[PDB]
Design a binder for this molecule. Structure first.
Ligand code: VO4
Length: 296
């Protein structure tokens, strides 16, 4: 059981060890395409690649490569695309993927600048009146409205296939307050954010997979996906205890390497799942407690 194991690991001070065990046991698959020299400038990090078997392919004729993975959670029956923060030359590719995968939501779990560096290209419009055109992929992107809260912002974007003049509404969920070092302020603000994403519909099976990223698309993206899937699972079974966080994580690492980057992120994941489980099991009021504790 989850809380039991949590305290025991806390008491034994062995998160570093537990996490390192997950690292040792994690799947290792080839990333041949990511590593082709022609794709060198499509990767933000040398050490962060999509496996060949689970990578998302652009329907481009030219070069179908983007650093992005399909995490397909069979039992939970939810899918996620995890990707790196777009680069100045892959913003086009990014929206092409969003378009071709029929995604409804984009969860961004980083700020454009962190620790004094540029973690991500400015890949969406910041003002209604300056829409963005992506020439390489023939897509138009327009800011329709935005709802700024204390520690996250939700934007409504319109994505137009210039080739066919067909258009969609994309929801952009931007978590801005994950700390530079350490883990978010509390479970509460993080869970409050996840639940906003869930309520948007962006996770429904009727849409393509939600697109989730931070800078590398593994650490904070891992935490978000792991928590969502774990809660989803205990919701489906209404049995908090059959859910093995570490086992779920290893299952996700079959699809993308390095999900969850620090032992502290792992401990935070437990925290968020344990806390979020309160809501899952019939306690509706807990979600209102997170909204207030998040200070949005
Ligand atoms: O940009 V991330 O994979 O280190 O949280």
């Amino acid at each position: 059981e989850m809380e039991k194991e949590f305290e025991q690991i806390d008491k034994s001070g062995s998160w570093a060890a537990i996490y390192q065990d997950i690292r040792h046991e994690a799947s290792d698959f080839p990333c041949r395409v990511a590593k082709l020299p022609k794709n060198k400038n499509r990767n933000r990090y040398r050490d962060v690649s999509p496996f060949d078997h689970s990578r998302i392919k652009l329907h481009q004729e030219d070069n179908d490569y983007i650093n992005a993975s399909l995490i397909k959670m069979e039992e939970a029956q939810r899918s996620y695309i995890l990707t790196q923060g777009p680069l100045p030359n892959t913003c086009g590719h990014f929206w092409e993927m969003v378009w071709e995968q029929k995604s409804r939501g984009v969860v961004m779990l980083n700020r454009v600048m962190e620790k004094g560096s540029l973690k991500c290209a400015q890949y969406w419009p910041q003002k209604e009146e300056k829409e963005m055109i992506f020439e390489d992929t023939n897509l138009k992107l327009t800011l329709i409205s935005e709802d700024i809260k204390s520690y996250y912002t939700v934007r409504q974007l319109e994505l137009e296939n210039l080739t066919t003049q067909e258009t969609r509404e994309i929801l952009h969920f931007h978590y801005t307050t994950f700390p530079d070092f350490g883990v978010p302020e509390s479970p509460a603000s993080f869970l409050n954010f996840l639940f906003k994403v869930r309520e948007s519909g962006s996770l429904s099976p009727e849409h393509g997979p939600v697109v989730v990223h931070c800078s590398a698309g593994i650490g904070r993206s891992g935490t978000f996906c792991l928590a969502d899937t774990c809660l989803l699972l205990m919701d489906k079974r209404k049995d908090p205890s059959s859910v093995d966080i570490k086992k779920v994580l290893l299952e996700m690492r079959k699809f993308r390497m390095g999900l969850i980057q620090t032992a502290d992120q792992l401990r935070f994941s437990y925290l968020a799942v344990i806390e979020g489980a309160k809501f899952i099991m019939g306690d509706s009021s807990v979600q209102d407690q997170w909204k207030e504790l998040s200070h949005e």
